[PDB]
Coordinates of C-alpha atoms and ligand atoms in Angstrom, one line a residue:
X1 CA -23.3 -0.7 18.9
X2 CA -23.0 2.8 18.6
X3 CA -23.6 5.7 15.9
X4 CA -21.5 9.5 16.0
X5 CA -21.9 11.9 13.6
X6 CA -18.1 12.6 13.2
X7 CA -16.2 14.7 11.1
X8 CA -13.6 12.2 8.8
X9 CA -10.6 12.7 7.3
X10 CA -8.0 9.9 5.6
X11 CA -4.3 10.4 7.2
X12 CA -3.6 13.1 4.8
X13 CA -6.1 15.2 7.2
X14 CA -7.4 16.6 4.1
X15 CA -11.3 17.0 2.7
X16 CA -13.4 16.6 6.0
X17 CA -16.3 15.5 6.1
X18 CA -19.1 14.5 8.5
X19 CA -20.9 10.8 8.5
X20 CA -22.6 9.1 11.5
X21 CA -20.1 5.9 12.6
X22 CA -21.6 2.7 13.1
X23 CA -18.6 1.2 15.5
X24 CA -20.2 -2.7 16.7
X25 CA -18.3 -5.8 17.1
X26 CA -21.3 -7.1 16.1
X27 CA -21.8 -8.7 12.8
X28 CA -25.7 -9.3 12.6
X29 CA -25.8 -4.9 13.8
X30 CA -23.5 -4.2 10.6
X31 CA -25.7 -6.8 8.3
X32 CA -28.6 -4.7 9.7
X33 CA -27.2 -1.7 9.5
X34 CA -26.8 -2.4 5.7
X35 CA -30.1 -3.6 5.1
X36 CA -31.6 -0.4 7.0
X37 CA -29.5 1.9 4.2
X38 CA -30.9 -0.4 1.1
X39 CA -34.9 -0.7 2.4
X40 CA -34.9 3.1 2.2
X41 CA -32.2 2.4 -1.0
X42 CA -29.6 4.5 -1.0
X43 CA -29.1 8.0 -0.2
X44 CA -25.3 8.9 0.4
X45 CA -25.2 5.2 0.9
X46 CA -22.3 3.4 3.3
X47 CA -18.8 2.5 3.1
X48 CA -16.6 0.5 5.0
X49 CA -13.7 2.1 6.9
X50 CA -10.7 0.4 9.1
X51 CA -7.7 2.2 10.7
X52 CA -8.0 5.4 8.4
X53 CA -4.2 4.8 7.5
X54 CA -5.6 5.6 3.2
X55 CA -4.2 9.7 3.2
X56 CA -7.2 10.4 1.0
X57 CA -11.1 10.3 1.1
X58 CA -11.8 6.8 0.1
X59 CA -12.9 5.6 3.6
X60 CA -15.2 8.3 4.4
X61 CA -19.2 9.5 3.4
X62 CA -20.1 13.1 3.7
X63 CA -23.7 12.5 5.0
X64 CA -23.9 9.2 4.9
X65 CA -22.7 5.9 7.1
X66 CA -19.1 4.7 7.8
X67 CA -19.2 1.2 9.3
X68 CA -15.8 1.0 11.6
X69 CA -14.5 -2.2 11.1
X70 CA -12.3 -2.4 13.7
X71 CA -13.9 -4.0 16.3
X72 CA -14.2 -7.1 14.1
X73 CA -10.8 -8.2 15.0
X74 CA -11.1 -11.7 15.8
X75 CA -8.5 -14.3 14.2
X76 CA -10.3 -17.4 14.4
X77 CA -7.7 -20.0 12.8
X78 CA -4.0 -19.9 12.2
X79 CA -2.4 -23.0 11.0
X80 CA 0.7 -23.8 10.0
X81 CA 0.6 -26.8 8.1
X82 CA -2.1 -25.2 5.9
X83 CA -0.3 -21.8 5.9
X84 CA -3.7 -20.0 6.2
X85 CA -5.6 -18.0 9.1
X86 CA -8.7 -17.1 9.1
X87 CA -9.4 -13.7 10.5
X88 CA -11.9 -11.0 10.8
X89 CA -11.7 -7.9 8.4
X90 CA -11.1 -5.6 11.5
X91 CA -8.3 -7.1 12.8
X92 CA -4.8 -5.8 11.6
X93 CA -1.7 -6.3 10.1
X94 CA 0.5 -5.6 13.6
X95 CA -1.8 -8.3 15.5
X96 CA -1.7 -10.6 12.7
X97 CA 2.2 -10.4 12.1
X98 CA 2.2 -11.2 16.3
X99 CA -0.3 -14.0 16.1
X100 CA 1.3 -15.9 13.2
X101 CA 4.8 -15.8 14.2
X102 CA 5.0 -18.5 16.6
X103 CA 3.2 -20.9 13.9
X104 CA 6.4 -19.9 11.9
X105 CA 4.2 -17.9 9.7
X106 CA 4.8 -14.4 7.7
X107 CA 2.5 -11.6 6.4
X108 CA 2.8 -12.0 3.0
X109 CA 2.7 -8.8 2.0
X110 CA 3.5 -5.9 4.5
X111 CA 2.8 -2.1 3.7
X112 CA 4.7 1.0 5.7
X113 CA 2.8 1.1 8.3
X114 CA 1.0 -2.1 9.9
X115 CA -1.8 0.0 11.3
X116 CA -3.9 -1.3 8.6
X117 CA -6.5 -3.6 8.8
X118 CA -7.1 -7.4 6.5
X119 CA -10.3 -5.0 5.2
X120 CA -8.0 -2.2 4.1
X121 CA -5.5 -4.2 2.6
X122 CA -7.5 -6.0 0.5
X123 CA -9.5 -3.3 -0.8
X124 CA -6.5 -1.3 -1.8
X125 CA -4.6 -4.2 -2.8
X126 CA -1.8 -3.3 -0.6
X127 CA 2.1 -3.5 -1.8
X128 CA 5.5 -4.1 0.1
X129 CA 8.6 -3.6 -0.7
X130 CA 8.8 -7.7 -2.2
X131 CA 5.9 -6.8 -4.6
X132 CA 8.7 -8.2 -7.5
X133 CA 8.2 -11.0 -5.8
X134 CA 5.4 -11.8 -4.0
X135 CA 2.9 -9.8 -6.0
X136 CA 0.0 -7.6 -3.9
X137 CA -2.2 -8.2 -0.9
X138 CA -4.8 -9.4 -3.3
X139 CA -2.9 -12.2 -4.8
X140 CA -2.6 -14.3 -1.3
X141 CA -5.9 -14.0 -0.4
X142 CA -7.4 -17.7 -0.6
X143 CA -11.1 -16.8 0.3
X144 CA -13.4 -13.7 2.0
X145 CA -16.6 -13.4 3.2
X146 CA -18.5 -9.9 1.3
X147 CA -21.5 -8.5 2.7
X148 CA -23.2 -7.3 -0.8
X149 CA -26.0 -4.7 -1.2
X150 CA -28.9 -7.1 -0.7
X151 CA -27.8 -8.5 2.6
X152 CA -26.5 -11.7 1.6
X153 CA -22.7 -12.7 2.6
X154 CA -21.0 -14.4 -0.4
X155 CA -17.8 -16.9 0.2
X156 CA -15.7 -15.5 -2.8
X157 CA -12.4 -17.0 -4.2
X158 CA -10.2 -16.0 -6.6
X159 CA -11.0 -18.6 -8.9
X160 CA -14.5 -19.8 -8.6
X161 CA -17.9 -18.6 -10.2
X162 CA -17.7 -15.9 -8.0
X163 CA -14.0 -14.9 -9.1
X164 CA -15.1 -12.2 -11.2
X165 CA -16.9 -10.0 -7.8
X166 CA -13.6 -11.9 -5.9
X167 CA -11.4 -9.7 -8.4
X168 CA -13.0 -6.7 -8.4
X169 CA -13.2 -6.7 -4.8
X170 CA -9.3 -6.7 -4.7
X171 CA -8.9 -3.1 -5.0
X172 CA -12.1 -2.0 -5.4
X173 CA -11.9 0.4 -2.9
X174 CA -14.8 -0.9 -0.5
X175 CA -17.2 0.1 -3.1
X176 CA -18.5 -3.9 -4.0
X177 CA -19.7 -4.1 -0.3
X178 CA -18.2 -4.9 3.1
X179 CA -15.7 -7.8 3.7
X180 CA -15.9 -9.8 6.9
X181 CA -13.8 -11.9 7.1
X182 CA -10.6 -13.4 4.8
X183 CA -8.7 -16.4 4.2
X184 CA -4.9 -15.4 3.6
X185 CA -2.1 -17.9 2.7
X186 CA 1.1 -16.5 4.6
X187 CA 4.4 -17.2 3.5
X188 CA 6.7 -19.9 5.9
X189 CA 9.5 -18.1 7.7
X190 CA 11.6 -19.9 10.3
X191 CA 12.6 -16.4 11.7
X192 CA 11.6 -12.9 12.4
X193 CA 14.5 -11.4 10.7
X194 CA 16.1 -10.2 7.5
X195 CA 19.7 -10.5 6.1
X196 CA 20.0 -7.7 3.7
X197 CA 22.8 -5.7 1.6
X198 CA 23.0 -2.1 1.1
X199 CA 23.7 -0.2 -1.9
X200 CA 24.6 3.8 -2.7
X201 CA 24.6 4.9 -6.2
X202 CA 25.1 8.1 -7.8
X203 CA 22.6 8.7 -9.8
X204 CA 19.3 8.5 -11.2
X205 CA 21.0 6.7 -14.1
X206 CA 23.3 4.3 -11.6
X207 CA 19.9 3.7 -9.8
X208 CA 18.1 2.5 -12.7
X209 CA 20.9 0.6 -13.8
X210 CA 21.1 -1.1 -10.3
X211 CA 17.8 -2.1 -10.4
X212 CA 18.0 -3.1 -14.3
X213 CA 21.1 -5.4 -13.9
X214 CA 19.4 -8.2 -12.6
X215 CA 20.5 -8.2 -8.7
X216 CA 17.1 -7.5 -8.6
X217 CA 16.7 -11.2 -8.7
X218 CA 18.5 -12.2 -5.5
X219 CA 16.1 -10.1 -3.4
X220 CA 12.5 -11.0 -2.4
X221 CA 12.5 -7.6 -0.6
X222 CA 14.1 -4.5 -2.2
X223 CA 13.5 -0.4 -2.0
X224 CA 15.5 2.7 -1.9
X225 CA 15.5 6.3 -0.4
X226 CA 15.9 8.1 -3.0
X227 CA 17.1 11.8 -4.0
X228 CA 14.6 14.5 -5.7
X229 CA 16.0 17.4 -4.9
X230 CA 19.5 17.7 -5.9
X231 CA 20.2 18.9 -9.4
X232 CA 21.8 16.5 -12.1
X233 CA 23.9 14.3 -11.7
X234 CA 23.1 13.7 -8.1
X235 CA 19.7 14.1 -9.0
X236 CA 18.4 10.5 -8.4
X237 CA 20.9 9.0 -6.8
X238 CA 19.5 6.0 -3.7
X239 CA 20.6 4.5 -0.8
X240 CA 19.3 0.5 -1.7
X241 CA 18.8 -1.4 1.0
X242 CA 17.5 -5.3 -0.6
X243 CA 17.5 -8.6 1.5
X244 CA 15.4 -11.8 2.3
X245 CA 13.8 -13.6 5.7
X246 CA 17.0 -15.2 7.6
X247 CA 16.8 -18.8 8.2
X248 CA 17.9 -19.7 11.3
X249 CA 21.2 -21.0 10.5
X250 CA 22.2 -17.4 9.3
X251 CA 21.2 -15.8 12.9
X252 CA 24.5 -15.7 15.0
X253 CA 24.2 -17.8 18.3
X254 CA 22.6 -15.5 20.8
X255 CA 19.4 -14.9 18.4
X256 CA 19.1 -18.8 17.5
X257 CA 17.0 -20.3 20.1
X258 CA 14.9 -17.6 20.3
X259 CA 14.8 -17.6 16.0
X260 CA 10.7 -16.1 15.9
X261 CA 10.8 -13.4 18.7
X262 CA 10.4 -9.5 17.9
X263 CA 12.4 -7.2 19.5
X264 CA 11.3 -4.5 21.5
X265 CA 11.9 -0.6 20.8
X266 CA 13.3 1.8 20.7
X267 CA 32.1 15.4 11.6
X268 CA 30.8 18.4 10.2
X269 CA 33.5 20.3 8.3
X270 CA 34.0 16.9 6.5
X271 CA 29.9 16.8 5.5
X272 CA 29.6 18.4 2.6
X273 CA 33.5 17.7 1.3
X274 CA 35.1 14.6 -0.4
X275 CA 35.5 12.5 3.0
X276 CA 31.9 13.1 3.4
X277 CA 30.8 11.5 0.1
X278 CA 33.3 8.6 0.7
X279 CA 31.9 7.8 4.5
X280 CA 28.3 7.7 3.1
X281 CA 29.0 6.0 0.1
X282 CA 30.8 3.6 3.0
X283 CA 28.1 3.5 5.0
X284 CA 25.5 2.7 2.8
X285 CA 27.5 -0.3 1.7
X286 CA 27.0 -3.7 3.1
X287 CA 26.6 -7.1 2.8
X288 CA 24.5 -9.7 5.2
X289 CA 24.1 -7.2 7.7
X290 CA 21.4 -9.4 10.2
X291 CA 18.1 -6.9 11.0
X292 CA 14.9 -8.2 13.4
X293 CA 11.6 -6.6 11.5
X294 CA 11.2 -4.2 14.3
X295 CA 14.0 -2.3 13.0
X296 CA 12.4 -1.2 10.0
X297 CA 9.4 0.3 11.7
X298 CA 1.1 20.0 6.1
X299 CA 2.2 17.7 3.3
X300 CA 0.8 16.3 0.2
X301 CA 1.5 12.3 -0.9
X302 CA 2.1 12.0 -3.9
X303 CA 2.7 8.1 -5.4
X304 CA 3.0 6.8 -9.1
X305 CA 3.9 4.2 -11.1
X306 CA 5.6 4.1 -14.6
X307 CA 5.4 0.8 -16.9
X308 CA 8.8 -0.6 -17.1
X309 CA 9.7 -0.1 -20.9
X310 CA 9.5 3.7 -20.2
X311 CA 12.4 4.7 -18.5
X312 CA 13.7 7.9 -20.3
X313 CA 9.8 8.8 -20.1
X314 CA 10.8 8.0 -15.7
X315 CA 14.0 9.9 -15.7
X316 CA 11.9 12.7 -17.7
X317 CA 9.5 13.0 -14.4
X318 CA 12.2 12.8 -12.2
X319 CA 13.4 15.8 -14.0
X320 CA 10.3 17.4 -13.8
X321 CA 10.0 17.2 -10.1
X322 CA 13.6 18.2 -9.4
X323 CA 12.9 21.6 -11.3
X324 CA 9.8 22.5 -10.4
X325 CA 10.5 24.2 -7.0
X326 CA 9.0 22.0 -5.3
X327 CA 10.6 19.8 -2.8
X328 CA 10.6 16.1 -1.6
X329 CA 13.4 14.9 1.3
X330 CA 11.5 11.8 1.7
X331 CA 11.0 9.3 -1.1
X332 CA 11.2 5.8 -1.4
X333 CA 11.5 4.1 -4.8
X334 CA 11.3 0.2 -6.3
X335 CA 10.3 -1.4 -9.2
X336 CA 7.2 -3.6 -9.0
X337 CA 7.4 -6.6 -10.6
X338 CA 4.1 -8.4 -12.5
X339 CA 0.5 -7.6 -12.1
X340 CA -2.5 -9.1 -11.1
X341 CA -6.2 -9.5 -12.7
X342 CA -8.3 -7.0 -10.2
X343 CA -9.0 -4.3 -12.9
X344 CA -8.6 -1.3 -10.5
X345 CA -5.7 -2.8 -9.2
X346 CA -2.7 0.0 -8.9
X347 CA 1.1 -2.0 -8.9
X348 CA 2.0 -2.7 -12.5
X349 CA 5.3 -3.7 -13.3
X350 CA 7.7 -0.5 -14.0
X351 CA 9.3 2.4 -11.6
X352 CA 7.3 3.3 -8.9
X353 CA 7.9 6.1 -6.7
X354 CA 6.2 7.8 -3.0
X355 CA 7.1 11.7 -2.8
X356 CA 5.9 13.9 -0.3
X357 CA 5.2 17.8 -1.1
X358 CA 5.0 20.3 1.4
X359 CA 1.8 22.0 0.8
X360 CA 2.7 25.9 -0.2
X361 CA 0.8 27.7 -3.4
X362 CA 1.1 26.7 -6.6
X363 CA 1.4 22.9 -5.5
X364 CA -2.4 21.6 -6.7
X365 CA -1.5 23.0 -10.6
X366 CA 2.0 21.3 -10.5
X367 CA 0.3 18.1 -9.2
X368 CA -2.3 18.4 -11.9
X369 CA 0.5 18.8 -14.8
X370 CA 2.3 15.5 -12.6
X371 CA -1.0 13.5 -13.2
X372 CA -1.4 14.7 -16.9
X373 CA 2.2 12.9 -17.5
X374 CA 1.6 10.0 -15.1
X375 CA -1.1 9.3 -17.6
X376 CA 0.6 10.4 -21.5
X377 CA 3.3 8.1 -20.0
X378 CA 1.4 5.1 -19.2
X379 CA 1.3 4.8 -15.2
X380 CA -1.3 5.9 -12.6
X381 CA -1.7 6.9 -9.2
X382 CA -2.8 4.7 -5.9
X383 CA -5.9 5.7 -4.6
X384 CA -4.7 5.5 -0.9
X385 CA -2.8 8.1 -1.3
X386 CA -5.0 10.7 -3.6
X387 CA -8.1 12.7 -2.8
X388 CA -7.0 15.3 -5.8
X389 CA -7.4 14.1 -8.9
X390 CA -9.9 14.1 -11.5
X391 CA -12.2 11.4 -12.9
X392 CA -11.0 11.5 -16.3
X393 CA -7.4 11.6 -15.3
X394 CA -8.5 8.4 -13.2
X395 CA -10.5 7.1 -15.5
X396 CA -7.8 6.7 -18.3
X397 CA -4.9 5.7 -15.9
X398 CA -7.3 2.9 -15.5
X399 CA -8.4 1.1 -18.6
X400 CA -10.0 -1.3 -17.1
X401 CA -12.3 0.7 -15.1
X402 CA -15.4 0.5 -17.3
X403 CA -15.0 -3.2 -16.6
X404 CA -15.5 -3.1 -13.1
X405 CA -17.9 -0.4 -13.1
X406 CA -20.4 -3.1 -14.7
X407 CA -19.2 -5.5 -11.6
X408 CA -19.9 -2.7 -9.2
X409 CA -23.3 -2.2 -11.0
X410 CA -24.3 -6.1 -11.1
X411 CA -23.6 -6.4 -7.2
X412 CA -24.9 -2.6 -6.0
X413 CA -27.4 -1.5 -8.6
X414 CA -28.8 1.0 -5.9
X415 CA -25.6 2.8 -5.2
X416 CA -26.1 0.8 -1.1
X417 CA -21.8 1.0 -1.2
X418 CA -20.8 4.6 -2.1
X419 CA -17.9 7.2 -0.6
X420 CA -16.4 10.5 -1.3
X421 CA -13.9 9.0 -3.3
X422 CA -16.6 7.2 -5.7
X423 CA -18.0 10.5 -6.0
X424 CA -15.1 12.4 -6.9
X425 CA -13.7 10.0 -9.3
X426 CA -17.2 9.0 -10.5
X427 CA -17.2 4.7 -9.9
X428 CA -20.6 4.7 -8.9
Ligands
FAD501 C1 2.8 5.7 7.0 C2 2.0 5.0 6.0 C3 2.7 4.1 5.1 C4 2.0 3.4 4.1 N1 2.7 2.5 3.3 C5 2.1 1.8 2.2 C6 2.7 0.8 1.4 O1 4.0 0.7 1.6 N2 2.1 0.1 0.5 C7 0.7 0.3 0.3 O2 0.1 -0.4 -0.5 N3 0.0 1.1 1.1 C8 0.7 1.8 2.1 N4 0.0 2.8 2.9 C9 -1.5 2.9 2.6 C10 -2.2 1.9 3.5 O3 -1.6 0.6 3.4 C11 -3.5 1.7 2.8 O4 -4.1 3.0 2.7 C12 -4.4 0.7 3.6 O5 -5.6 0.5 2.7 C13 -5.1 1.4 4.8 O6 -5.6 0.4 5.6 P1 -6.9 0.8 6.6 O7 -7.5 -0.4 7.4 O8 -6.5 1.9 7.4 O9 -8.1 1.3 5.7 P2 -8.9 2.6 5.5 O10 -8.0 3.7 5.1 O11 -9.7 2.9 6.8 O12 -9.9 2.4 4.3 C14 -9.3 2.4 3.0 C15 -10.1 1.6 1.9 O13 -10.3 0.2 2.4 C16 -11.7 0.1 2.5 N5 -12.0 -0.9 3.6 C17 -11.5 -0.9 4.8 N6 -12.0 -2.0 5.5 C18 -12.8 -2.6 4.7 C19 -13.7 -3.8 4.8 N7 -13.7 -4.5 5.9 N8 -14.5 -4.1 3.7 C20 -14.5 -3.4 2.6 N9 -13.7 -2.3 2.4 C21 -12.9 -1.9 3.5 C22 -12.3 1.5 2.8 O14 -13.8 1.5 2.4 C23 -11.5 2.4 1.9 O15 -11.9 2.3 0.5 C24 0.5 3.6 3.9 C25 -0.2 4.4 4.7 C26 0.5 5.2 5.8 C27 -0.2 6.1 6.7
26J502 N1 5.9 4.9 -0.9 O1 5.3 5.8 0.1 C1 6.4 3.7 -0.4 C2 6.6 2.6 -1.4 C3 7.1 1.4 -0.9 C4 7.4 0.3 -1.8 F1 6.9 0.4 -3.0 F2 8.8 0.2 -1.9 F3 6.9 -0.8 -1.2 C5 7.3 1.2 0.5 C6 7.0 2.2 1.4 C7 7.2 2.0 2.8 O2 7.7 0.7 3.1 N2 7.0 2.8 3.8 C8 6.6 4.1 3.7 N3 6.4 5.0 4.8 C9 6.7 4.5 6.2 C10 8.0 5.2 6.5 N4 8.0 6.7 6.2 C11 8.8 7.6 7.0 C12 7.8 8.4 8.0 C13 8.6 8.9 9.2 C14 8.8 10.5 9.2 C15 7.5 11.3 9.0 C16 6.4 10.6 8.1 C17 7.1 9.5 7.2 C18 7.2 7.2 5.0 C19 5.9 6.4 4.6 S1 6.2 4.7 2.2 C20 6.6 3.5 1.0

């Protein structure tokens, strides 16, 4: 059960700054550990952190404790008849995926990296690329285990007394106390593979019609690379790549008996001419092209949502960024379907897009004018990616925020439960 002082960072490698580490696979250490910061109640507090896979500054505590959650990785139930396993916070997404498999069991909801652990993805209600369709992390989880700020470990579910702390704990950012351990429903799956169809399109305006058509529907998984650097027309145009789990009957022969197994690792005068658009456009066109999962798997992130109903207010962003001199190769792009109740929850059902700025001067103030129509046009930004933006930007992206404030303040009156992100963005 040790303790470091250790300078933190989120992935981002941004905003360092130092907290001892409390690293224990022991649960009774990390109740006590907790206890230790509320008797003396509460300084610069404690937060949670697992794999450090958030880019900003939400898992970390300049001068205060970081409880590492990782080794609290044990997965004490999987059961397929049930669907649910019952796991430690600590343990993560690439172990679970592994573990659940043979059970003929899925992750319900898989982010872009599976370095993440149950704790993380609950707490930023993680989304995949079938959030039209399966919703957010938060919405399969079935029970979990919170450490609070007065040492008790309360058995929440989302639609008990307790649903209210269950819901705000969805989200919340690690800020309503520690999870422990979860309860997720996982979705059946009689293979490890997809069957998927590729799209290209033109245009931001063929792209949003794409996705406005209704094929939408076909797919329980669906996102797009996406282009923000060319000018009109091409501006916008995607590379769609949407698809479903393969049942077993749709796997040729080979890959049948073995239907649950992942894989292991691991002409240019034409290019820029007419025979170059035409072999893309072919190549990036599709249909039930078979893929196993493990196929799939300086700067500043930059991720935002816009409500559905205001798409010349998206194509008017889009615009922004393409013109602004700064620019994004890699984006990815998909509209979320319906929301759930956690109040600082971040999908909400409209065009959501990841961009990723090389950091050069003048970057911070163009980010600040991004946020400031984010917000005028009804969206927000995803705390795992930010460690920029102001409170009252935040604040009225969020609408619900006040809400869970008063949830925050009924479970941690004495601020036990704080980080450099609840600072900044002023939760506590
Ligand atoms: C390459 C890359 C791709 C990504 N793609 C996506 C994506 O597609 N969709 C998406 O939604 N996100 C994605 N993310 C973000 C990542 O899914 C989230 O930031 C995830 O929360 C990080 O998991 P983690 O265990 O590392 O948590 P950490 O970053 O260590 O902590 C993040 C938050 O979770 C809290 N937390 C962690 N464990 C616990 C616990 N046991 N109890 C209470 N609070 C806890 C922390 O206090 C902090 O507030 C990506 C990140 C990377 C680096
Ligand atoms: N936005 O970052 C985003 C959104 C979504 C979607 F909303 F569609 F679910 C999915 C999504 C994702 O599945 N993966 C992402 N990343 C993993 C792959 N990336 C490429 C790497 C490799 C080169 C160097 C760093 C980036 C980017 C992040 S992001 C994402």
């Amino acid at each position: 059960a040790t303790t470091t002082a250790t300078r933190l960072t989120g992935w981002g490698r941004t905003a360092p700054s130092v907290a001892n580490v409390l690293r224990t696979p022991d649960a009774e250490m990390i109740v006590k550990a907790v206890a230790r910061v509320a008797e003396s109640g509460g300084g610069r507090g404690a937060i949670a952190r697992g794999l450090g896979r958030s880019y900003g500054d939400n898992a970390q505590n300049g001068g205060g404790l970081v409880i590492d959650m990782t080794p609290l990785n044990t997965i004490h139930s999987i059961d397929a008849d049930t669907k649910l396993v019952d796991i430690d916070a600590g343990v993560n997404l690439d172990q679970l995926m592994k573990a659940a498999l043979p059970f003929g069991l899925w992750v319900p909801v898989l982010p872009g990296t599976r370095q993440v652990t149950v704790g993380g993805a609950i707490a930023c209600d993680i989304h995949g690329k079938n959030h039209h369709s399966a919703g957010s992390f938060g919405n399969h989880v079935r029970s979990m285990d919170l450490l609070t700020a007065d040492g008790e470990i309360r058995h929440l579910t989302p639609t008990g007394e307790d649903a209210e702390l269950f819901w705000a704990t969805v989200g919340g950012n690690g800020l309503t106390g520690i999870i422990m351990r979860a309860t997720i429903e996982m979705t059946p799956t009689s293979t490890a593979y997809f069957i998927a169809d590729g799209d290209v399109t033109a245009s931001l305006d063929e792209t949003i019609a794409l996705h406005s058509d209704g094929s939408e529907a076909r797919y329980t998984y669906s996102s797009a690379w996406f282009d923000a650097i060319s000018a009109p027309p091409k501006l916008g145009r995607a590379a769609v790549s949407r698809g479903r789990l393969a049942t077993v009957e749709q796997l040729p022969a080979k890959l049948r008996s073995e239907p649950l197994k992942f894989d292991a690792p691991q002409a240019n005068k034409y290019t820029f001419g007419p025979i170059g658009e035409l072999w893309y456009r072919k190549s990036g066109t599709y249909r039930g092209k078979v893929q196993n999962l493990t196929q799939f798997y300086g700067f500043l992130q930059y991720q935002f949502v816009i409500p559905t109903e205001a798409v010349d207010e998206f194509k008017k962003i889009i615009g922004v960024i393409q013109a602004s001199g700064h620019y994004s190769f890699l984006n990815v792009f998909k509209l979320f379907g319906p929301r759930n109740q956690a109040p600082l929850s971040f999908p909400i059902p409209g065009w959501n897009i990841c961009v990723d700025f090389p950091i050069k001067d003048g970057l911070g103030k163009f980010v600040s004018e991004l946020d400031r129509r984010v917000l005028e046009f009804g969206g927000r930004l995803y705390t795992a990616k930010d460690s920029r933006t102001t409170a009252e930007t935040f604040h009225a992206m969020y609408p619900r925020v006040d809400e869970w404030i008063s949830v925050r303040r009924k479970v941690d009156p004495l601020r036990v439960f704080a980080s450099d992100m609840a600072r900044r963005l002023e939760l506590l």
